[PDB]
Design a protein around this ligand. Structure first.
Ligand code: CA
Ligand code: CA
Length: 327
DNA sequence: CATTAGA
DNA sequence: TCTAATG
């Protein structure tokens, strides 16, 4: 967590670059298991050779470790950090819809800047074009103060359309977090669960409402269960407009909520941790269900859920108010 | 790890 | 179809 710090962070830098600027999936996979093993070690690494004892650690990375260790740096690490093209990719990627594939592709083409991107909006796709529009706005944080304004409205139409809908703005926000990056709306209906062969319109209906009132402004992607978009808070009695925000809304089988909900509500840890317990508690939790183990090795049989409660009751824990689901 | 666009 | 990108 700290005594191993420099090694890791270097290693990740190491990894991330391989997958990113190069195509090095493996070196990249190589680096990560290392900064993985190397992270777990309980003592200080005083030498490569020492590290090298590790699993996944080799001549390759040990050599790296000594140098890192000997002098406060690493050249390979230094040259990339300097590397124009490489920087370029790490940069372009920041764009909503740009990825390592596109990244590099763009780059070989001559497009290295935010401005480059503009002169050739043609070369970009709807996702990316949008992404281009709201680069600034997408990188911003989202004050909870707004989370609530956003939350409100949405819960607002959700209701108008159909009183029988259920939404839950999950994520960090949910968890009381001062600021969030994207609003995360989960959504279900009685009329849609397990077998009931959809009703895509279930999803569609809302999206329409939302735009209809001006909450929705663009569509990154729209599927019959997963809408992916851009929203905005009605820029008040002037002098103050609201930055465009990323939003996602998703359809779900009422028979699946609570877990679903539980899950996306995190924290990443809280989950893993509760989940670990469900194992002892003779269970299994996953993004959609809760099944009870069979000593045989594994088992099935989805236990029925009406709330975050059942899931608690099942594994015999203390219901954790989302506030404190941090770990 | 599943969903969407796209080409 | 496969492949890239978000989450
Ligand atoms: Ca080894
Ligand atoms: Ca990106």
């Amino acid at each position: 967590e700290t005594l191993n710090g420099g090694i890791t962070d270097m290693l990740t830098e190491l990894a991330n670059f391989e997958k990113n600027v190069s195509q090095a999936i493996h070196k990249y996979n190589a680096y990560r298991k290392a900064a993985s093993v190397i992270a777990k070690y309980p003592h200080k690494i005083k030498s490569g050779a020492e590290a090298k004892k590790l699993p996944g650690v080799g001549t390759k990375i040990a050599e790296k470790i000594d140098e890192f260790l000997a002098t406060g740096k690493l050249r390979k690490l230094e040259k990339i950090r300097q590397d124009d093209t490489s920087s370029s990719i790490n940069f372009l990627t920041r764009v909503s819809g740009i990825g390592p594939s596109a990244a590099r592709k763009f780059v070989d083409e001559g497009i290295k800047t935010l401005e480059d991107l503009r002169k050739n909006e043609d070369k970009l796709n709807h996702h990316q074009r949008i992404g281009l529009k709201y680069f600034g706005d997408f990188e911003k944080r989202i004050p909870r103060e707004e989370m609530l304004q956003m939350q409100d409205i949405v819960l607002n139409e959700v209701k108008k359309v159909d009183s029988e809908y259920i939404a839950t703005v999950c994520g960090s926000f949910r968890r009381g977090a001062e600021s969030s990056g994207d609003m995360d709306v989960l959504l279900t209906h009685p009329s849609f669960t397990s077998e009931s062969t959809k009703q895509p319109k279930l999803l569609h209906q809302v999206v329409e409402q939302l735009q209809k009132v001006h909450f929705i402004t663009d569509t990154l992607s729209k599927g019959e269960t997963k809408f992916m978009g851009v929203c905005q808070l009605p820029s008040k009695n002037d002098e103050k407009e609201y930055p465009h925000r990323r939003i996602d809304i998703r359809l779900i089988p009422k028979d699946q909520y609570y877990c679903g909900v539980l899950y996306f509500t995190g924290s990443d840890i809280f989950n893993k941790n509760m989940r670990a317990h469900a194992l002892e508690k003779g269970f299994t939790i996953n993004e959609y269900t809760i099944r009870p183990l069979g000593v045989t090795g594994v088992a099935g049989e989805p236990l029925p859920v009406d709330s975050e409660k059942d899931i608690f009751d099942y594994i015999q824990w203390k219901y954790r108010e989302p506030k404190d689901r941090s770990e």
